[PDB]
Amino acid sequence: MVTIRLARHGAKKRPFYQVVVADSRNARNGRFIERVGFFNPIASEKEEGTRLDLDRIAHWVGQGATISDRVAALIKEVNKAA
Amino acid sequence: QHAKAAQVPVVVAVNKIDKPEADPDRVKNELSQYGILPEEWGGESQFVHVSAKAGTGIDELLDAILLQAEVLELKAVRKGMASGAVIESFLDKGRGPVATVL
Amino acid sequence: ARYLGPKLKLSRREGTDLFLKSGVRAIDTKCKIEQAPGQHGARKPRLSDYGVQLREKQKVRRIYGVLERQFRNYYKEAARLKGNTGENLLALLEGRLDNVVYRMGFGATRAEARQLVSHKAIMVNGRVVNIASYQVSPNDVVSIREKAKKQSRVKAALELAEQREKPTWLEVDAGKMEGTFKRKPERSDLSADINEHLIVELYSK
RNA sequence: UAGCUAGUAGGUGGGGUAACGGCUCACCUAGGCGACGAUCCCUAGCUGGUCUGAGAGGAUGACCAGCCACACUGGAACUGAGACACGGUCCAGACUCCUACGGGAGGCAGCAGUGGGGAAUAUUGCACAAUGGGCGCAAGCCUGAUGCAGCCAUGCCGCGUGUAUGAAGAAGGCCUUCGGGUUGUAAAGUACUUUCAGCGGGGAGGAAGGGAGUAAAGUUAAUACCUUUGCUCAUUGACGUUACCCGCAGAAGAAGCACCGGCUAACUCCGUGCCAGCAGCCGCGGUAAUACGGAGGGUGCAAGCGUUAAUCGGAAUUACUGGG
RNA sequence: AAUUGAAGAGUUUGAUCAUGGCUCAGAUUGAACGCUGGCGGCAGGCCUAACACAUGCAAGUCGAACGGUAACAGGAAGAAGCUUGCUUCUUUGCUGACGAGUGGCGGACGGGUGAGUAAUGUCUGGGAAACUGCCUGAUGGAGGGGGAUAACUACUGGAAAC
Numbered sequence: 001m002v003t004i005r006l007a008r009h010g011a012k013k014r015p016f017y018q019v020v021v022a023d024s025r026n027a028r029n030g031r032f033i034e035r036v037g038f039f040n041p042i043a044s045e046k047e048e049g050t051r052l053d054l055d056r057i058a059h060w061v062g063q064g065a066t067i068s069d070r071v072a073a074l075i076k077e078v079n080k081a082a
Numbered sequence: 083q084h085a086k087a088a089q090v091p092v093v094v095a096v097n098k099i100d101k102p103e104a105d106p107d108r109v110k111n112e113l114s115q116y117g118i119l120p121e122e123w124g125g126e127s128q129f130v131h132v133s134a135k136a137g138t139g140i141d142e143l144l145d146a147i148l149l150q151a152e153v154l155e156l157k158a159v160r161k162g163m164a165s166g167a168v169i170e171s172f173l174d175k176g177r178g179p180v181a182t183v184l
Numbered sequence: 185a186r187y188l189g190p191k192l193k194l195s196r197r198e199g200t201d202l203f204l205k206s207g208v209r210a211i212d213t214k215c216k217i218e219q220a221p222g223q224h225g226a227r228k229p230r231l232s233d234y235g236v237q238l239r240e241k242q243k244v245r246r247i248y249g250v251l252e253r254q255f256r257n258y259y260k261e262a263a264r265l266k267g268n269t270g271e272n273l274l275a276l277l278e279g280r281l282d283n284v285v286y287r288m289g290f291g292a293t294r295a296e297a298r299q300l301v302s303h304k305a306i307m308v309n310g311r312v313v314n315i316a317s318y319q320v321s322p323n324d325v326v327s328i329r330e331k332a333k334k335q336s337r338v339k340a341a342l343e344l345a346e347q348r349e350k351p352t353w354l355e356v357d358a359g360k361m362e363g364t365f366k367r368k369p370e371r372s373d374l375s376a377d378i379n380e381h382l383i384v385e386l387y388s389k
Numbered sequence: 390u391a392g393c394u395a396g397u398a399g400g401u402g403g404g405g406u407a408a409c410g411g412c413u414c415a416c417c418u419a420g421g422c423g424a425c426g427a428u429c430c431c432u433a434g435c436u437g438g439u440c441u442g443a444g445a446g447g448a449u450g451a452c453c454a455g456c457c458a459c460a461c462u463g464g465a466a467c468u469g470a471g472a473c474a475c476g477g478u479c480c481a482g483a484c485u486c487c488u489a490c491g492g493g494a495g496g497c498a499g500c501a502g503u504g505g506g507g508a509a510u511a512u513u514g515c516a517c518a519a520u521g522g523g524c525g526c527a528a529g530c531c532u533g534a535u536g537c538a539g540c541c542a543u544g545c546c547g548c549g550u551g552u553a554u555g556a557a558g559a560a561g562g563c564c565u566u567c568g569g570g571u572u573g574u575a576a577a578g579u580a581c582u583u584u585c586a587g588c589g590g591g592g593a594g595g596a597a598g599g600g601a602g603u604a605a606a607g608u609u610a611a612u613a614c615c616u617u618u619g620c621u622c623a624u625u626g627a628c629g630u631u632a633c634c635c636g637c638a639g640a641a642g643a644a645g646c647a648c649c650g651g652c653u654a655a656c657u658c659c660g661u662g663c664c665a666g667c668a669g670c671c672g673c674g675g676u677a678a679u680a681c682g683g684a685g686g687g688u689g690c691a692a693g694c695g696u697u698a699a700u701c702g703g704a705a706u707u708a709c710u711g712g713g
Numbered sequence: 714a715a716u717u718g719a720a721g722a723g724u725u726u727g728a729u730c731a732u733g734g735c736u737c738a739g740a741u742u743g744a745a746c747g748c749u750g751g752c753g754g755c756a757g758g759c760c761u762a763a764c765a766c767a768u769g770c771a772a773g774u775c776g777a778a779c780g781g782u783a784a785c786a787g788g789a790a791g792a793a794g795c796u797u798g799c800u801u802c803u804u805u806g807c808u809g810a811c812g813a814g815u816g817g818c819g820g821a822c823g824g825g826u827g828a829g830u831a832a833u834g835u836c837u838g839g840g841a842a843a844c845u846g847c848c849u850g851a852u853g854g855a856g857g858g859g860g861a862u863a864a865c866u867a868c869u870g871g872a873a874a875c
Contacts, residue, residue, distance in 0.1 A: 001847060001848040001849090002848070003521095003848095005520090005521070006520065006521085007520080007521085008519090008520055008521090008535090008536090011755075011756095012536090012537090012755075012756090013536095013537090013595080013628085013631090013632085014595085015519080015520075015536095015595075017520080024521095024522075024822090024847085024848095025522090025822055025823085026822090026823090027521075027522085027534075027535095027822090027823060027824095028520065028521045028522085028534085028535075028823095029453085029454080029521095029535095030454075030455090030823095031454085031455070041519095041594085041595065041596085041597080042594070042595065043594090061849095062849090062850090063848090063849075064848050064849030064850080065848080065849085066848075066849095068520090068521085069597085069598075069599095070519095070520080070597065070598085073597055073598070074597085077597085173504080174503090174504085174767075175503080175504055175505095175765090175766070175767075176503065176504075176766060176767025176768075177503070177504090177767055177768075178502085178503045178504070178767090179503090179504095185547085185548060185549060185550085185691085185692095186548095186549080186550085186551090188550080188551085188644085189575085190573075190574070190575050191574080191575095192573085192574065192575085193573090193575085197687095197688090205553090205554090205574075207553060207554070208553090208554065208555095213556080213558090214555090214556085214558090214573095214574060221571090221572090221573085221686090221687080222571070222572075222656090222686050222687050223563080223564070223570080223571055223572080223656075223657070223685080223686045223687080224571095224656050224657070224686075224687080225571090225686095225687085226570085226571095231654095232653085232654080234653070234654075235653090235654055235655095238653095238654055238689095239654080242654095242689095251690080251691070252689090252690065252691085253546085253690090253691085254546090254547090257546090263717095264717095266715090266716095266717080291552095292552090292553065293552080293553075295551085295552065295553090296552055296553065296582090298552090299551065299552050299582065299583090299584080300552090300582085301584095302548080302549080302551095302583095302584045302585090303551095303552095303582060303583060303584050304584065305582090314547095314548080314584075314585095315547070315548075316547095316548085317547080317548095332582085335581080335582080336580080336581055336582090337552085337553085337581060337582060340553080340580095340581085341553095385720090388719095388720065389720050389721070389738075389739075
């Protein structure tokens with residue numbers, strides 16, 4: 001079934017996550033329905049680094065998709081306002 | 083010859099003790115001829131009687147081994163060094179090449 | 185990395201000085217210019233059309249003190265940019281950190297400038313920078329940090345620095361061991377020695 | 390490789406499948422496919438792409454990702470939402486092991502690793518700390534996925550192996566018209582700096598969460614209880630002598646490789662004498678070899694260099710663009 | 714704000730111009746070998762025998778589905794040794810739990826490989842005659858009964874598996 005989850009494409013010892021809508025059976029790096037944001041935990045002092053289109057995430061929750069615990073935490077971090 | 087050239091303490095044993103036709107004096111005298119290890123001195127040797135098939139022993143052999151190890155001290159390094167010599171080396175199909183090291 | 189060899193042989197082979205030594209005096213006696221190094225250099229060269237291209241590649245490369253693989257990377261970047269490739273080549277070479285230190289006159293020579301940037305004397309916008317190849321931006325202050333401040337190394341250099349004709353694209357400063365890089369070099373600002381179509385031509389074949 | 394097809398091609402009816410269907414059967418008709426290359430043989434996993442190329446094109450499908458196929462060989466079904474099932478099952482075959490010899494057990498084209506092949510490709514490692522799965526209300530357990538380390542200049546990229554001054558134009562080497570020239574500011578000497586290694590200290594971030602106590606709202610018989618939203622207090626790092634920063638000492642620990650007849654950047658002497666050998670191509674060597682062997686000098690490139698093999702380019706030398 | 718680019722030389726002849734092959738300068742690899750080799754970052758690392766394999770490890774998990782004690786970790790009760798306040802030792806599923814077992818869900822995913830496959834395949838653009846556990850929205854039921862069986866006990870065939 002559909003799950004909102006963090007996939008890691010970044011370099012060795014510098015994870016850069018791509019928050020993404022995918023089925024549960026597929027591997028972390030594998031097949032997916034669509035991208036929805038990104039999350040850099042390593043980050044830098046610049047303002048950008050956590051981004052998520054909420055109209056997309058609320059749509060997928062409306063279609064019944066469940067949310068991975070990190071992405072669930074990042075949604076309740078960014079809210080309307082952090 | 084291997085005992086003198088490697089400088090090794092030497093012990094001997096009679097194999098055929100059970101037989102009366104296999105008397106110890108023939109064995110004792112015939113290897114006494116050599117220019118190193120003559121026999122029946124009570125020094126530089128110890129004589130053993132062991133059955134071929136039973137066998138018999140081991141106290142007399144054990145005493146001979148104990149006396150040579152008591153007469154010359156034997157020690158080994160117990161930290162930071164591992165060393166020895168190779169007995170036999172072979173190849174096994176499942177485990178690979180192996181070797182038996184003393 | 186680095187040439188490491190005798191400096192004057194390169195100037196004598198190229199037949200025009202490359203400024204590699206040139207601290208205390210611009211001495212004629214040592215240089216022996218246009219006589220060529222080694223046994224048979226006395227004879228007239230009668231150089232080929234391939235050789236005049238290959239010579240000019242070495243002449244430019246030996247000024248900045250680059251190796252062919254690093255130098256090739258500047259050519260690839262200069263080519264993809266709009267406008268003249270030779271000018272965008274010389275802009276990236278002049279944009280080096282070890283080069284700006286020589287232009288500001290903090291170091292006596294380009295090798296001493298590379299030594300000071302390697303030895304972590306030099307800071308750009310308050311970052312320390314190890315890498316000599318580092319690409320300086322417009323609006324970049326540059327300075328010596330406290331450990332390397334007021335040593336015999338910088339102090340002798342700042343004296344002989346006054347003789348120079350003084351660059352047009354940067355502010356010199358240097359009353360308190362710093363400098364500011366204002367804007368890009370352009371073809372008029374930089375020297376007339378280089379034949380710029382010629383060095384680019386050699387990579388075409 | 391020019392003829393190939395009987396369930397072959399079409400219809401009706403029955404049976405079958407989740408569902409269309411010659412899917413499978415009975416019966417009826419005589420068609421189907423075929424030079425716009427059927428059928429047969431050889432060879433081949435395919436594509437997003439990679440590599441080359443001015444583009445058109447050509448070659449190619451490792452890594453990464455999508456999809457299909459296969460799981461000792463050969464065949465079949467069950468269970469199940471989904472398999473005709475890589476570490477499930479049953480039978481036959483090959484083959485290995487075990488055995489009281491009657492009869493049984495096993496399938497690294499999983500991760501490591503070994504035999505063997507071959508020119509040649511690694512440690513019988515650490516941890517669920519992180520991401521993501523499986524189960525569970527949850528704690529938690531499991532996870533050779535994955536995250537990480539070890540090993541190899543295999544490739545790409547960065548940096549270093551010092552800097553400045555310095556004529557005595559030193560000594561030594563090499564050549565010489567035996568006057569000298571060159572090696573060579575190179576050295577030596579003197580003045581400076583110590584990056585990265587070595588040695589001693591300090592020290593980010595990857596951790597959000599989860600747990601135990603509490604308050605409020607929702608809740609109901611209820612202040613329970615439970616869930617949610619705040620809060621406080623204990624904490625959670627495999628990698629890890631982490632990244633990174635400071636300190637100490639002293640030029641100290643750190644440059645090789647090919648090539649120099651023309652093509653093609655870079656020259657003389659000596660040895661050998663069509664011998665020895667060089668050679669990518671045309672070619673050099675049979676007594677003064679700028680081409681062999683050695684030495685000096687020089688040129689290119691750099692922790693790599695060269696050779697060889699493989700692909701495209703140059704090649705308008707399969708030419709559509711672009712030939713005869 | 715934006716998608717810029719094309720080099721030739723040597724070699725047939727006494728000499729020339731064509732035709733025309735051969736060869737070289739370029740870039741590159743999942744490379745090998747030779748000589749040489751200080752450190753770091755990042756990436757890669759059996760292309761050959763889909764040849765065969767030792768040993769260890771790679772799929773299990775739920776007591777909030779259920780009989781249960783095979784555990785061992787306590788409590789309680791009880792019996793003892795006396796130190797009369799304590800250890801000791803039998804009972805007891807009462808309990809924090811939990812082997813084997815019943816039952817649930819996962820084992821069809823994750824991972825490896827390029828042997829076979831030139832069309833049941835793949836890629837691109839469309840379609841109807843379909844299913845779809847796990848995941849969601851919507852509307853209602855969730856009443857009342859029965860017979861087994863493994864485990865476990867009592868035995869027994871088997872070298873071992875079974």
